[PDB]
Amino acid sequence: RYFDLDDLENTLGSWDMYGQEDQKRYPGLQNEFFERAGESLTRREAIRSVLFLGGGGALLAWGAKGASDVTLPITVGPQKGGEKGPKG
C-alpha cells in the first residue's frame, strides 16, 4: 500500500537520484574572475552564429594560408613526376 494520491510526485519514482543540496563548494578567490567571464556571450542567435560564422573560419584561413600542408594536392602535392597511361 502506497497511494498518497494527493501527491503524484512520489508515485512516479521520479526522484532525482544523485542531486545534492550542498551550495557552492568553490572558492571566492577564483569565483569573481570566472563569474564575470561567462556572460560576455549570453545570447541565443548572435553568439552561436559567431561560432559558425567567425569560429569555423580557421578551416578557411589556415587551410589556405599557413604552409604546414602535408602531401596536400593543395600545395606541396604533385611535385614528383606525373603518371602516363599505356595508350596516352
Partner 1 sequence: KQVIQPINGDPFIGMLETPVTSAPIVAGFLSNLPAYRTGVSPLLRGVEIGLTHGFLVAGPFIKLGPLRDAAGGAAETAGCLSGALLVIILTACLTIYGQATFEDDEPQIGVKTLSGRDIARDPLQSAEGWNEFTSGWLVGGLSGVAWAYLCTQFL
Partner 2 sequence: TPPQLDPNTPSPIFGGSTGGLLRKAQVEEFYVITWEAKKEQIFEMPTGGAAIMRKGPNLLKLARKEQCLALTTQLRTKFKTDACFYRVFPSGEVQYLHPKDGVYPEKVNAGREGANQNMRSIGENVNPIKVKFTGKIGPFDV
Partner 3 sequence: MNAAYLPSIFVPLVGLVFPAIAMASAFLYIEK
Say how far apart CA 64 and CA 75 lie, in whole Å. 9
In whole angstroms, how close is the CB of 15 to partner 1 at the nearest point? Answer: 5
Contact 24, 33 (CB under 8 A): no
Applying CB under 6 A, which of residues 23, 40, 42, 68 lies at the interface with ligand CLA? 68
40 contacts partner 2 (rule: CB under 8 A): no
Place of cell 510526485: 9
Say how far apart CA 39 and CA 25 lie, in whole Å. 21
x/- mask, partner 3, residues 11-50, rule CB under 8 A, reads -------------------------------------x--
- Footprint on this chain of ligand CLA (rule: CB under 6 A): 52, 55-56, 58-59, 62-63, 68, 70
